[model samples]
Target: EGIKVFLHERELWLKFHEVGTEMIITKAGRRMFPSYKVKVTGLNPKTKYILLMDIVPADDHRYKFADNKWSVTGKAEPARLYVHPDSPATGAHWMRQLVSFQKLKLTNNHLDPFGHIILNSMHKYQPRLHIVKADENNGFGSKNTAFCTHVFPETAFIAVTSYQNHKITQLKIENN
Candidate 1:
């Protein structure tokens, strides 16, 4: 198969949807499963790329996966994201640097006085990883290109779960 423009590997796309994946959250923070270990090769060795990770709500509805269908469970609350500390660093900061994405986690505890990462239950979300080329040709040294990956909010559950639909997974695996 031909290489996909959006992602680096076909297997990586398949793994994103292959299981009942969930990101654990606590007051301290939780790690993301199937870490965002993307293989970037189109960059210049001498050039630099800034890596950033952000998560956003895919929808505003709280979902419950029962009877093989996603139904509204409740109203969604405000959303928050955690930025990697190594942000604004060069690609070399992440490349060959087996970093742990476990810091990105969501909490259902709304009363998180310590200001934990709270998110609406059952809402879909997408994690975006941006790679910027720090060069003069674009605009500033911060000009960049981005890569994104969409993950279901329900998949962030704590225990074992099941997904009613597999279209996203199937398509990604087949295409990449």
Candidate 2:
């Protein structure tokens, strides 16, 4: 049987944009507004799934918002990755929980190079979530399948910076 990927366009993305586009970051951790909540269906309720969330830089350059336009400048910062907690669990458990997701947050300070939270300003980025099925049959390879959703690079933005604008917020809410 084939797997279907459902995009919660109207509900998920819209709510994220509605709460404002740019995320705020400080020395401490910041909570992501309009959290990434997704409902998974059409699964063998008895099987298990591993959920993951990661963020990638949209481009290899910094952004400048001058003259009412966004321009690329300088080099981009290093990439960062975030992982979800509820991984490798039964579809029945995930579905029964209704909406589930790995929350992504942003931070400005680069105090910890090994830190997966801090990010550079004026840089574009994309957030991706992946779901994979786990199986013990065929040497644990029988149920090897994965589904992914990307937030798109051009539409991504750094959490704190002078180039930050409210335009992305409008698009997030109005589009869906």
Candidate 3:
């Protein structure tokens, strides 16, 4: 088979997905509750690979939780990218590892300086996983590298300053 990726702790993610996952974005920055982790397969053993994680808006409109439901409120915010610090590792090393992104943090601060991902409160976002085969220079900026994107629908979530829904809060507490 070709390159394949499987979400770790998928059942837990589905529980949050059904209840509408919400990620806390604070002034300082907060790590995701259901920290992003994955298991991958099907790569050339010795070829160098780079892994990246980025969050993108799930929809065009902003949202607010009201009357026990989330509804469209206004327009949306922005997006950003993050590279795995252990990138440019051989496929053998990548495939053998758990590939956890627990260190990634979300922030509402527009002028964030720590390379943390910035998201506006109340906006829905989907975290994406990117796999790129490095060029001879061991970089992805060149056109010769093979690039692929993996999106998990269950990873979709809303960015919030505080937990807006009690059910989500309860579920997070129960799971943690």
Candidate 4:
């Protein structure tokens, strides 16, 4: 298969449903729950790979909880793009045992400094992992680097200032 990829937490999403995956964002910065853990297969081991993680709104909807589920009530606000500082490492590094997002964070702070993904309240999001080859050992800035984007549907989650849905929050706590 071509660049096989698997979401490390796929089981959880399917069980709770896509909307169940929720991320807590605060003015003081909150890291994602079940922070993206991804695995990759079929790659050139000799060629170095750098991993970049970013979250984007899943759709143009502002969701509201009703009838024990989330629903689109209006259009979503603009999202602020954020990139990790350790982007574009080697495949060995990206797959060094298990890959996880250490730098990615979420915050309600409009003036966040950590490249935190600024998400609108009650909106859903999808996080993506990109593998970009490092043309040179010097840095990832080198030109001519090939890139592959791995988007796992299991990584989609809801962004909320607080636990608008306690049952969802409880489920997340039940999981590691």
Tell me the tens digit of each residue's lDDT in model 4 across 1-176.
Answer: 26777777677767655447677888777877776676777766666666677787788888988777777888888655444455545555555566767557788888877667777778888888777676766355648777788787777888887777777777777885
Candidate 2 clash pair list: none
Candidate 2 lDDT (Cα, 0 to 1):
0.57
lDDT of 3 by residue, 29-104 (tens): 8999898999999988888898999999899889989999999988885447889989879999999979999999
Candidate 1 per-residue lDDT, tens place, 86-172, comes to 654554555544444445555556776654566544566666655555555533344445433334333333211223456434543
Higher lDDT: candidate 2 or 3? 3
Cα lDDT of model 2 by residue, 90-114, tens digit: 7777777545443555677677553
Question: What TM-score would every model get versus the actual structure?
Answer: 0.56, 0.67, 0.93, 0.84
Q: Assess candidate 4 and give its TM-score to the true structure.
A: 0.84
Task: List candidate 1 segments past 4 Å from native.
Answer: 1-20, 73-75, 78-82, 92-94, 97-100, 109-117, 135-176
Candidate 2 Cα misplacement greater than 4 A, ranges: 5-20, 78-80, 112-116, 137-155, 161-163, 166-176
| Alpha-carbon RMSD of each model | 7.6, 5.0, 1.8, 2.6
Best prediction by lDDT: 3
TM-score of 3: 0.93
Of the pair 2 and 3, which is ahead by TM-score?
A: 3
lDDT of 4 at 83: 48
